[PDB]
C-alpha cells in the first residue's frame, strides 16, 4: 500500500521557528510511522499513515533546534514496538522511548525494552484509537515494570472523573498526554483546567505534557486560547511539566500544523528562561535520562 496513497498528516516544508530552543532541549512527545515495508502497521490500527521514519524525525528535530527526543509508540503499530526501537537505536544516544505492551508481557521482554531505550508504557483511553482499555490488566502490568519506569496516560476530559480511581492506584509515576485534552476555549480557570488541577493536586508524581494547541484549540494558529489557558498551568506546576511537538501529528490531516508555529508556542506558555529550562531540559531529563541527573 503505496506511500503516497497513505495519510499525510504533517507539513512537508515546515516554517523555521522564531523561537530557538536551548541547548539540550528535549522533544518529549513524537512518533515514527514505519517505514511500512520494514515495519508493518498493526491489524488493530485505526489509521494508515504515510511513512515517517527515523531520518525524517531527526531532520525535523534538527530543523526545529531540538537536541533529544522521546519517541512514543504510536497506536498504528499496536504492541509491536519495532519501528520505535529502531528509531531509538538510530538516534545514537539522543532518544529514549515509550512502549505499548501486551499487559501479559514477561519481565524478560520488559528488560529487553529497557535495554532498547524504553522508560515507560502508554495507556490509550481514546476509543477512536484503540478499542480496548482493560483497566484491571493495565493496573497489573503497571506494577511489573522495570525499575524507574513510568506510565503515560492519554484520555479525553469527559472521562477524567471516571479515571481518578484507576490513576490513584497506579504504582509508578504518571505522565499525562496533552493535559487530558482540556477545552482551552474555557480559559485557564475553566471547568476542564479546574478538574485537571484536582488530578495534579491528588498526587505529587503526576507530570503532564503542555502540548498540542493544534489538537485542542479549534481556532487555529496563533492558538490564543491554548496560550492563555496553558501558561498559568505551566507556571503553577513548573517542576512537573514537559513538552513535545507531537510530530508527525497522527490524525491531524484535517488541520495540519506548521511545526514552526507549534514550537513558537513554547515562549508563550513558558515565557521565562526558568520555565523554558525546566520544561525543555530539567524535567524531561529527570523522567527519561535520570542516570544523567
Instruction: Rank residues 167 and 204 by Cβ distance to ligand 0GY and give the closer one.
Output: 167
Strand order across the 174-176 sheet? 26-30, 68-72, 95-99, 118-124, 150-154, 174-176, 206-209, 241-242
At 95, phi and psi to the nearest 5?
Answer: -140, 150
Beta carbon of residue 205, minimum distance to ligand 0GY (angstroms, whole number): 21
Q: And the C-alpha cell for 84?
A: 520505535
Provide the β-strand partners of residue 175: 152, 207
Nearest CB to ligand 0GY, comparing residues 18 and 206: 206
Least spacing, CB of residue 53 vs ligand 0GY, in Å: 16
Distance of closest approach, residue 273 Cβ to ligand 0GY, in angstroms: 27
Closer Cβ to ligand 0GY, 77 or 114, answer by number: 77
69, β-bridge pairs = 27, 95
Residues that bind ligand 0GY (CB under 6 A): 74-76, 124, 129, 154, 177, 246, 250-251
Contact 96, 121 (CB under 8 A): no
Q: How far is 245 from 255, CA to CA, in rounded Å?
A: 15
Min dist CB 70 to ligand 0GY, Å, is: 12
Q: Considering beta carbons, is residue 206 or 212 the nearer one to ligand 0GY?
A: 212
Amino acid at each position: 500500500l503505496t506511500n503516497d496513497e497513505r495519510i499525510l498528516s504533517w507539513n512537508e516544508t515546515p516554517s523555521k521557528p522564531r523561537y530557538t530552543p536551548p541547548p539540550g532541549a528535549i522533544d518529549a512527545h513524537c512518533h515514527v510511522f514505519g517505514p511500512m515495508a520494514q515495519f508493518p502497521f498493526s491489524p488493530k490500527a485505526k489509521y494508515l499513515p504515510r511513512d515517517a521514519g527515523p531520518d525524517m524525525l531527526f531532520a525535523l528535530r534538527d530543523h526545529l533546534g531540538f537536541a533529544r527526543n522521546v519517541i512514543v509508540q504510536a497506536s498504528c503499530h499496536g504492541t509491536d514496538n519495532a519501528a520505535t526501537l529502531d528509531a531509538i537505536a538510530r538516534a545514537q544516544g539522543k532518544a529514549r522511548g515509550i512502549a505499548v505492551v501486551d499487559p501479559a508481557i514477561d519481565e524478560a521482554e520488559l528488560a529487553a525494552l529497557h535495554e532498547g531505550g524504553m522508560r515507560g508504557i502508554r495507556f490509550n483511553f481514546l476509543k477512536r484509537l484503540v478499542d480496548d482499555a482493560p483497566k484491571d490488566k493495565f493496573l497489573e502490568v503497571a506494577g511489573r515494570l522495570p525499575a524507574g519506569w513510568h506510565v503515560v496516560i492519554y484520555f479525553e476530559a469527559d472521562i477524567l472523573e471516571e479515571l481518578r480511581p484507576f490513576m490513584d492506584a497506579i504504582p509508578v509515576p504518571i505522565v499525562i498526554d496533552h493535559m487530558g485534552r482540556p477545552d482551552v476555549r474555557q480559559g485557564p480557570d475553566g471547568a476542564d483546567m479546574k478538574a485537571f488541577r484536582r488530578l495534579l493536586d491528588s498526587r505529587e508524581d503526576i507530570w503532564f505534557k503542555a502540548t498540542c494547541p493544534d489538537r485542542l484549540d479549534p481556532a487555529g494558529p496563533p492558538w490564543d486560547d491554548f496560550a492563555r489557558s496553558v501558561a498559568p498551568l505551566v507556571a503553577d506546576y513548573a517542576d512537573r511539566v514537559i513538552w513535545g511537538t507531537a510530530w508527525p501529528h497522527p490524525n491531524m490531516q484535517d488541520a495540519i500544523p506548521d511545526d514552526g508555529l507549534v514550537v513558537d508556542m513554547i515562549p508563550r506558555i513558558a515565557p521565562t528562561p526558568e520555565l523554558q529550562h525546566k520544561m525543555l531540559v530539567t524535567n524531561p531529563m529527570r523522567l527519561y535520562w535520570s542516570e544523567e541527573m
